Design a protein around this ligand. Structure first.
Ligand SMILES: CCCCCCCC/C=C/CCCCCCCC(=O)O[C@@H](COC(=O)CCCCCCCCCCCCCCC)COP(=O)([O-])OCC[N+](C)(C)C
Ligand SMILES: CCCCCCCC/C=C/CCCCCCCC(=O)O[C@@H](COC(=O)CCCCCCCCCCCCCCC)COP(=O)([O-])OCC[N+](C)(C)C
Ligand SMILES: CCCCCCCC/C=C/CCCCCCCC(=O)O[C@@H](COC(=O)CCCCCCCCCCCCCCC)COP(=O)([O-])OCC[N+](C)(C)C
Ligand SMILES: CCCCCCCC/C=C/CCCCCCCC(=O)O[C@@H](COC(=O)CCCCCCCCCCCCCCC)COP(=O)([O-])OCC[N+](C)(C)C
Ligand SMILES: CCCCCCCC/C=C/CCCCCCCC(=O)O[C@@H](COC(=O)CCCCCCCCCCCCCCC)COP(=O)([O-])OCC[N+](C)(C)C
Ligand SMILES: CCCCCCCC/C=C\CCCCCCCC(=O)O[C@@H](COC(=O)CCCCCCCCCCCCCCC)COP(=O)([O-])OCC[N+](C)(C)C
Ligand SMILES: CCCCCCCC/C=C\CCCCCCCC(=O)O[C@@H](COC(=O)CCCCCCCCCCCCCCC)COP(=O)([O-])OCC[N+](C)(C)C
Ligand SMILES: CCCCCCCC/C=C\CCCCCCCC(=O)O[C@@H](COC(=O)CCCCCCCCCCCCCCC)COP(=O)([O-])OCC[N+](C)(C)C
Ligand SMILES: CCCCCCCC/C=C\CCCCCCCC(=O)O[C@@H](COC(=O)CCCCCCCCCCCCCCC)COP(=O)([O-])OCC[N+](C)(C)C
Ligand SMILES: CCCCCCCC/C=C\CCCCCCCC(=O)O[C@@H](COC(=O)CCCCCCCCCCCCCCC)COP(=O)([O-])OCC[N+](C)(C)C
Ligand SMILES: CCCCCCCC/C=C\CCCCCCCC(=O)O[C@@H](COC(=O)CCCCCCCCCCCCCCC)COP(=O)([O-])OCC[N+](C)(C)C
Ligand SMILES: C[C@@H]1CC[C@@]2(OC1)O[C@H]1C[C@H]3[C@@H]4CC=C5C[C@@H](OCCC(CO)CO)CC[C@]5(C)[C@H]4CC[C@]3(C)[C@H]1[C@@H]2C
Ligand SMILES: c1ccc2c(c1)CCC[C@H]2Nc1nc2ccccc2[nH]1
Ligand SMILES: [Ca+2]
Lengths: 1105, 82, 92, 91
């Protein structure tokens, strides 16, 4: 068929002919007039029954000869005299003209379609996602009129209480009924032009203009609404999406459409809201101005089961007025003022031009309405009764379908309307069965409903009680909500295989992810023997600190808005925002690496940097409250996050705005001093004390009450507890600043000797100055061997990979290898006694030194970068050398553009040679640097150093060179200058941060560097290794000092979440925003109130007169 | 448009011939200068512009191998027909 | 306590409310039985409950102990007897 | 322009009509210039396109690259990216 729509659905056509009129108004032989003016109970004319066999049944008059027991026919059975057929219509209405050619859809189906057959097209054919609500509108069919307030206010709600939910509004479609006014709201309050509220307007095939235009299989019906008042067929209202053109076989008349409307409104109450919720999608009913049949069908809902509620609004008009007028009377139904039933019937008499014989049962119909004054939510539009109508509808469903507060909560959890919950469920005395609240948290978590999580926490859900092992196993193992495909890709990687078919994730498998994401030696609670034993076993089946487990969940499941919510709660907020930043960042790098799904990788690096900026903005807030304790917050062992540190994490997330913040730069300096007080002391005295060891004793140290915030080593804290003299030499030599200035004076004694050897002639054997030099590099090599073996990891593959990843561990390896190549060729060589420097092996190693020397002078930029003025230029000399490579390629294209012609034009008798590789590159390079070779330009001139190069064509080179240098100096060299000017301020505000971040890795290499410099560091290796064959810097806080510190972090977080609140709520652009929103809501209650005053004074002067 | 004028119904050939050929509103003198260029001559005295003449402008303005609905054989045949 | 949250001052040492509690109308009295113990306290709004939970926004408590449970009494004695000695301490 | 469809091909034809009119103005002087009144009219259409590409590229980077190469068939079997190149629209 190529169309499932017409494969399943059918169409009704009057396949028989039933006249309904006999009397010849004109032209006594009725056969003539019966052709054109005698219609069937088919509605269509007897000749409009084409129906090819029935077209030949346009015989003399038609089927059933004139007499035929005259009153015989007059029935038109819709069963056999109206058969079915495959649908000839199905398309997309264009609505040509009125707003950007808004679309809608239809089929033209028969009402034969069983209720379940009608639901199983709306979802899968038209891709209408299942609703959370249904706002069938059962008011007046004939057009009616409203007041400017109620017109727009009810247009606020049908947009508000339906855009939030799914809200398949059920209308009549036509531009005359309630369908009329609802569409007018859809334009005035035009929502964000998107999939807005998809109104599913059931239309009859009866009162419909352009019915022929609808007859097209996959046809864009060029539809146009004529407002011709002479017209009688009702045009479809403009603002309606998908239509259901119910086909009864007839035209012009009502009927079948009402049958479908129950029969879809009853199966959508049989479909479930969501996999998590067990309820069915509820149904409401709204009444605008009603009518006689309306007052009947309003009631039957209040009677029939399930109790479909109703939202009959009072202000609209004729019927709805009185159905609400009686709500102001008839208290609890059965109680009935018998003196008012003549009065209200007198109001019924005047509105419907209504009869008194019929005044008992219509009045009676309003009684059982009033016997059910519990779910008939008579919205008093006038006042603030129950709220704006948006809330009234959603409030009508909860209060009235005999539903537990849980069952009320699970619905609002689906709608994602919290305001309903805070003010109609979390109101007052209410049963709140505690197990229920727990189960609701399980649902708000799996989806993403942060706002109900906050709500439930703020109404008694202690996560300690609600975070057991099997519950949290689900929270990873749910497709019932926003999911991250990485997590099921990470787990199958670490398991090194393929997940079995079902595979509910175990929390062990998560630990193997976070220990892989965070990395290094991070060891999570899940993998440890305690958890791994109580887990396989199954308040021990709870967790100690739950929001540390949910925060690693919302960050593996890419639920930021939860992570920001679960981060700000709990404790350790600065370690949670630097673990998160390391989880995401370590997820983002997996995304870029493996491409099995969409990228997602820049969505995370923005999520990480959002956590890696709350930490930094929380360090500042602490550093601005107590600079001392705020440096304890960076070094206290955490013990929930793998015996780690709020500053070793940032370094692992490579977060520079923290490691290069001013509190991680004081501490790094207070750690750089050591026990020394280099505030009271001076750098002269360090060097003076290193070479005069007794001068160590004339130094101003710090007390162990000043070194509180500094992390100290294992035995370092042992000393201070249990200043004596042996604790002066230990305190100095184990200071980083001393470890530094005790190397820099061996290294600057290395470079003064190796340089002395490089420069001075070199004999068969090394000299005293040269053995000390070999000795440094050897012991400096070992110091880098040992720097690998003790680089705080278990994976040799990862230690070696992080060692060579630092700029100098390579260069040192280049410089250490080369030197022993050098010593290899220098010492491991023969000796040509008659003349040294003939042995090209000796020479070779000789010249390894003279070039290896350059590696060691650039070391000094490691030592020289300790300064805060210098280092940020040493880091610039690299960030330009990179960013300038392409200006410099051009300058080498300009250099061969000149050198190849200059060398060809001048030296034309050149056999192939390697000097043709120098001479095309040599002079044009020195030209850039002040040289011009002036007596070589114009080689035929008298003043020539090259009077032999003169010959045919050599007059071209002054021109080539003129163009060359113009391009070099006046264009390309000033393109460098211009480059270095405009990349200076950038690279200067980066090379600082790159420097302040390499400072960590520099200082915290001296806290584990030995004491002794690398000529005689070997003793501190000897006396660390043979003693090792016989068998970090932590913050030691007593017990109360942990307590005072936690009280400080809590205090500083509280201010952070309180000052941001102030900087925004008490800014300017926000303050203009409120002043706008106030003066909005003022001016409404100005003109409204001020009107009423004038309606008083015009009366008050008439009351007295 | 927001009260029921579907341009499909209201854009017939003779109507749109006027819309170019009106001094009854803000006019552009280029258009009467462009048309006399592509025709490579001088417009006769009255000269209501034909939509063919517009195609010879837009195919000249847009340029290259742009071929407009007006110059094509379908339109050029239903036009001289009417 | 409801005022202390709606009008939540700058989160600091705010107004330290010293709420004298009886050992009488008090839920989770057993949870309070701990020497240097962080009582994992949780307020149940169970309407079937009868013991009165401590209000949320209150700092330091005085759990007056009369030896009995569920009933009022002794707590009112302390309240004069601190409100009368603080009128004996000087402002500054 | 804002009505109908093909709004990105209509704003790059327009920008090419005006721009190609402006160049006729400067070339032949039989009336007042008008030629900078158009180049501001073109660049006004040649900036709604670009601000409509961004809005698409910020909604689905894939389909928004189909919007640049689908044969149009109302605008001479052409492309919403061969037009811009003809209007020499760099943004
Ligand atoms: C004395 C006579 C002989 C020597 C004189 C001649 C010496 C010649 C010159 C020598 C200059 C030496 C310094 C530069 C080399 C890289 C240093 C480094 O750590 O780079 C990186 C390690 O990046 C890695 O991926 C890890 C290891 C890379 C090793 C590559 C060696 C290349 C040099 C070949 C061997 C040359 C040895 C020649 C001799 C046989 C660090 O990062 P980055 O570099 O800042 O940026 C790159 C970023 N990246 C990490 C993502 C990639
Ligand atoms: C942290 C990790 C990074 C650092 C790496 C550290 C490791 C360093 C890496 C080194 C790798 C480089 C190769 C080895 C060097 C020698 C190569 C060579 O050419 O040798 C020559 C000498 O060979 C001899 O045996 C005689 C001289 C003594 C050798 C001293 C060099 C080895 C010292 C290493 C101490 C390192 C231990 C350092 C402590 C850890 C062989 O050739 P030839 O004799 O010239 O040829 C004769 C020709 N003729 C007769 C014609 C003249
Ligand atoms: C014919 C001549 C042609 C030219 C020849 C070559 C000469 C010119 C070149 C020379 C050097 C080329 C190799 C090293 C530099 C490359 C790396 C770099 O630029 O910076 C990078 C590393 O480096 C730094 O961040 C610090 C910079 C170190 C200073 C370089 C010493 C130069 C002095 C030598 C004096 C000896 C002179 C005497 C010698 C006899 C930083 O760059 P970035 O932008 O951050 O990139 C990302 C880095 N990341 C991945 C780590 C995050
Ligand atoms: C397009 C953009 C604008 C370009 C601007 C103009 C471009 C330059 C225009 C220059 C004017 C023309 C100069 C040459 C004239 C003829 C020379 C001649 O006859 O003989 C000369 C030969 O030597 C040469 O021919 C060498 C070329 C001259 C130098 C080129 C200019 C470079 C510097 C300036 C560039 C910028 C200057 C800016 C201008 C103010 C000398 O006489 P001879 O005796 O034959 O030689 C000695 C031989 N003997 C010893 C054997 C006897
Ligand atoms: C600008 C202000 C200054 C004045 C301007 C007035 C200009 C008047 C100029 C006139 C030029 C004609 C005079 C030379 C001819 C006579 C014979 C002669 O000397 O031949 C020489 C050919 O040398 C040349 O041909 C020189 C270059 C010619 C072009 C002149 C510059 C063009 C304008 C600028 C733009 C150009 C592009 C620049 C880049 C943009 C060879 O003589 P030689 O070199 O001595 O070699 C002798 C030895 N040998 C026999 C072994 C070979
Ligand atoms: C704060 C500063 C940093 C601390 C310092 C750094 C650490 C430690 C510092 C230096 C290491 C020790 C250096 C001295 C050892 C050698 C002694 C010597 O001169 O022997 C030699 C003397 O003999 P000669 O008279 O030259 O005669 C030639 C001898 N030959 C024939 C054997 C060749
Ligand atoms: C690895 C780390 C080691 C630590 C360093 C300490 C150990 C290294 C120390 C000493 C080792 C050498 C001892 C052997 C005897 C010396 C012989 C000699 O050369 O004498 C010369 C002086 O000395 C020099 O010219 C070289 C040594 C001193 C200067 C260079 C090293 C300075 C750095 C290290 C110290 C400062 C460090 C400060 C930096 C902050 C004099 O003789 P001459 O010039 O040949 O001429 C004599 C006249 N005649 C020829 C006419 C007869
Ligand atoms: C671990 C890595 C190891 C690296 C490779 C180790 C390579 C070891 C290589 C060689 C060791 C063996 C030496 C002898 C070589 C054979 C030739 C010979 O014997 O004599 C010839 C030497 O000719 C030369 O060219 C010698 C110099 C070559 C050294 C090149 C090293 C480059 C490494 C750069 C640094 C690397 C940095 C790496 C950075 C990571 C000639 O001399 P002769 O015959 O003895 O007598 C005099 C001749 N005459 C009569 C003509 C005057
Ligand atoms: C043996 C007799 C004794 C004397 C020997 C030793 C003499 C002295 C040796 C060197 C000069 C430094 C002396 C002044 C130090 C002041 C302290 C200081 O601030 O240091 C800074 C630099 O610290 C360094 O270590 C910089 C590197 C110096 C050693 C390497 C040589 C580089 C220069 C040679 C290049 C070749 C040039 C060659 C030119 C021909 C680090 O600290 P800061 O962050 O700036 O601290 C300021 C704030 N605070 C103090 C509160 C923390
Ligand atoms: C200061 C510069 C020198 C020092 C160099 C060391 C520092 C270099 C560091 C960073 C710069 C960029 C990355 C390193 C280069 C890798 C290749 C590359 O990028 O090729 C590019 C094209 O490159 C070419 O086409 C060049 C080929 C000829 C090289 C000739 C050198 C001329 C200089 C000789 C001297 C004569 C001077 C004459 C007188 C002045 C391809 O583009 P790409 O790869 O997509 O772009 C970079 C991507 N990346 C950033 C992610 C990597
Ligand atoms: C021999 C090894 C060759 C293979 C490469 C080894 C790889 C590097 C491994 C290890 C590095 C360290 C140990 C080996 C190098 C130093 C010892 C040495 O060689 O002394 C030499 C004596 O030299 C003298 O008498 C002159 C002065 C130096 C003596 C003190 C040694 C230098 C270090 C002091 C300060 C730091 C130490 C303090 C640490 C606490 C003996 O050398 P030789 O060749 O046997 O003798 C030849 C003739 N000669 C006697 C005239 C010299
Ligand atoms: C894109 C850039 C275009 C320019 C350029 O780079 C790339 O193109 C390269 C090609 C190179 C030449 C190729 C082969 C040889 C043969 C060799 O023959 C040894 C003979 C004998 C010695 O006596 C042995 O014993 C001598 C050198 C020579 C001519 C090269 C010179 C440099 C040249 C011109 C290079 C030049 C810089
Ligand atoms: C040339 C010079 C220095 C450097 C390089 C290259 C490559 C990266 C390592 C860096 N060294 C370094 N020393 C420091 C001391 C204090 C603070 C920051 C420091 N950075
Ligand atoms: Ca110069």
């Amino acid at each position: 068929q190529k169309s499932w729509i017409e494969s399943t659905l059918t169409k009704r056509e009057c396949v028989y002919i039933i006249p309904s009129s006999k009397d010849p108004h004109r032209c006594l032989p009725g056969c003539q007039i019966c052709q054109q003016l005698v219609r069937c109970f088919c509605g269509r004319l007897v000749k409009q029954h084409a129906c090819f066999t029935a077209s030949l049944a346009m015989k003399y008059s038609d089927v059933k000869l004139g007499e035929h027991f005259n009153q015989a026919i007059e029935e038109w059975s819709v069963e056999k005299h109206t058969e079915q057929s495959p649908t000839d219509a199905y398309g997309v209405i264009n609505f040509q003209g009125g707003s950007h050619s808004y679309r809608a859809k239809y089929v033209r189906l028969s009402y034969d379609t069983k209720p379940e057959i009608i639901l199983q097209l709306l979802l899968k054919e038209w891709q209408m996602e299942l609703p959370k609500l249904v706002i069938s509108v059962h008011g007046g069919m004939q057009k009616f009129e409203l007041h400017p307030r109620i017109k727009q206010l009810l247009g606020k709600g049908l947009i508000k209480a339906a855009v939030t939910t799914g809200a398949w509004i059920l209308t009549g479609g036509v531009n005359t009924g309630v369908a009329k006014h609802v569409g007018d709201a859809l334009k005035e309050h035009a929502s964000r032009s998107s999939r807005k509220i998809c109104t599913i307007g059931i239309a009859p095939w009866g009162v419909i203009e352009n019915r022929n235009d609808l007859v097209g299989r996959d046809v864009v019906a060029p539809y146009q609404t004529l407002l011709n008042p002479l017209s009688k067929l009702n045009v479809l209202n403009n603002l309606h999406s998908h239509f259901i053109l119910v086909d009864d076989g007839t035209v012009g008349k009502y009927g079948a459409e009402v049958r479908l409307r129950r029969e879809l409104e009853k199966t959508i109450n049989q479909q479930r809201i969501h996999a998590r919720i067990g309820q069915g999608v509820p149904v409401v009913a709204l009444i605008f101005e009603g009518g006689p049949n309306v007052i009947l069908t309003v009631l039957e809902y209040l009677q029939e089961s399930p109790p479909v509620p109703v939202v009959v609004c009072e202000g609209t008009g004729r019927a709805a007025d009185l159905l609400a007028y009686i709500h102001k009377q008839t208290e609890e139904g059965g109680n009935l003022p018998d003196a008012a039933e003549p009065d209200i019937i007198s109001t019924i008499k005047k509105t419907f031009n209504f009869g008194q014989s019929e005044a008992v049962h219509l009045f009676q119909t309003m009684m059982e309405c009033m016997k059910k004054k519990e779910l008939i939510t008579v919205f008093h539009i006038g006042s603030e009764d129950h709220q704006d109508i948006d809330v009234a509808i959603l409030t009508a469903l909860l209060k009235g379908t005999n539903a537990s507060a849980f069952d009320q909560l699970i619905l609002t959890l689906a709608w994602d309307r919290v305001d309903i919950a805070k003010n109609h469920v979390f109101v007052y005395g209410q049963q709140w069965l505690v197990g229920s609240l727990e189960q609701a948290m399980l649902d708000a978590l799996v989806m993403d409903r942060v706002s109900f999580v906050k709500l439930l926490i703020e109404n008694g859900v202690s996560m300690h009680k609600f975070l057991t092992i099997p519950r949290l196993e689900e929270l990873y193992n749910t497709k019932q909500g926003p999911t991250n495909p990485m997590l099921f890709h990470l787990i199958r990687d670490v398991k090194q295989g393929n997940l079995p078919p079902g595979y509910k994730i175990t929390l062990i498998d998560i630990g193997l992810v976070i220990e892989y994401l965070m990395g290094g030696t991070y060891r999570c609670t899940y993998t440890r023997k305690r958890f791994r034993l109580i887990y396989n076993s199954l308040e021990t089946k709870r967790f100690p600190y739950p929001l540390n487990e949910l925060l690693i969940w919302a960050c593996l499941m890419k639920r930021q808005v939860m992570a920001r919510f679960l981060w700000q709660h709990g404790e350790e907020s600065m370690a949670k925002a630097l673990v998160a930043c390391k989880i995401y960042r370590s997820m983002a790098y997996e995304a870029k690496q493996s491409d099995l799904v969409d990228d997602t990788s820049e969505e995370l690096k923005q999520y990480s940097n959002d956590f890696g900026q709350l930490a930094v903005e929380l360090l500042e807030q602490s550093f601005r409250q107590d600079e001392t304790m705020a440096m304890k917050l960076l070094t206290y062992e955490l013990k929930n996050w793998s015996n780690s540190t709020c500053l070793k994490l940032a370094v692992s997330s490579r977060l520079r705005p923290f490691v290069a913040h001013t509190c991680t730069q004081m501490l790094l300096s207070d750690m750089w001093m050591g026990r020394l007080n280099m505030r009271k002391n001076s750098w002269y005295k360090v060097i003076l004390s290193i070479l005069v060891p007794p001068a160590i004793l004339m130094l101003e140290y710090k007390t162990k009450a000043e070194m509180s915030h500094i992390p100290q080593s294992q035995d370092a804290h042992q000393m201070t507890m249990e200043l004596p003299i042996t604790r002066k030499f230990y305190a100095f030599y184990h200071a980083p600043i001393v470890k530094f200035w005790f190397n820099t004076l061996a290294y600057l004694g290395f470079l003064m000797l190796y340089t002395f050897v490089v420069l001075v002639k070199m004999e068969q054997l090394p000299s005293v100055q040269e053995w000390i030099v070999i000795a440094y590099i050897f012991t400096y090599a070992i110091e880098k061997v040992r720097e690998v073996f003790m680089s705080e990891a278990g994976k040799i593959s990862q230690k070696i990979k992080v060692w060579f990843s630092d700029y100098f561990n390579v260069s040192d390896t280049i410089a250490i290898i080369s030197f022993f190549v050098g010593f290899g060729l220098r010492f491991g060589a023969k000796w040509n006694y008659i003349n040294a420097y003939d042995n090209h092996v000796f020479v070779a190693g000789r010249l390894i030194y003279c070039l290896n020397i350059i590696f060691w002078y650039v070391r000094l930029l490691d030592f020289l970068a300790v300064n805060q003025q210098a280092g940020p230029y040493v880091m610039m000399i690299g960030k330009m050398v990179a960013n300038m490579f392409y200006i410099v390629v051009i300058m080498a294209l300009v250099l061969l553009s000149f050198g190849v012609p200059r060398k060809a034009i001048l030296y034309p008798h050149e056999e192939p040679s390697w000097s043709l590789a120098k001479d095309i590159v040599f002079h044009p390079y020195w030209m850039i640097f002040g040289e011009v070779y002036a007596y070589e330009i114009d080689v035929c001139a008298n003043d020539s150093t090259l009077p032999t190069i003169c010959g045919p064509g050599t007059w071209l080179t002054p021109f080539l060179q003129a163009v060359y240098l113009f391009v070099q100096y006046i264009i390309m060299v000033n393109l460098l200058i211009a480059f270095f000017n405009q990349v200076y301020l950038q690279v200067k505000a980066i090379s600082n941060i790159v420097w302040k971040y390499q400072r960590y890795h520099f200082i915290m290499a001296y806290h584990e560097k030995p004491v002794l410099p690398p000529p005689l560091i070997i003793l501190s290796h000897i006396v660390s290794l043979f003693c090792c064959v016989c068998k970090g810097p932590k913050l030691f806080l007593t017990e109360e000092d942990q307590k005072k510190l936690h009280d400080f972090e809590e205090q500083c977080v509280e201010m952070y979440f309180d000052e941001k609140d102030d900087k925004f709520n008490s800014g300017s652009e926000e303050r203009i925003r409120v002043t706008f929103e106030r003066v909005e809501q003022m001016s409404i209650q100005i003109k409204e109130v001020g009107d009423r005053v004038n309606y008083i004074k015009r009366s008050l002067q008439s009351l007295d007169s």
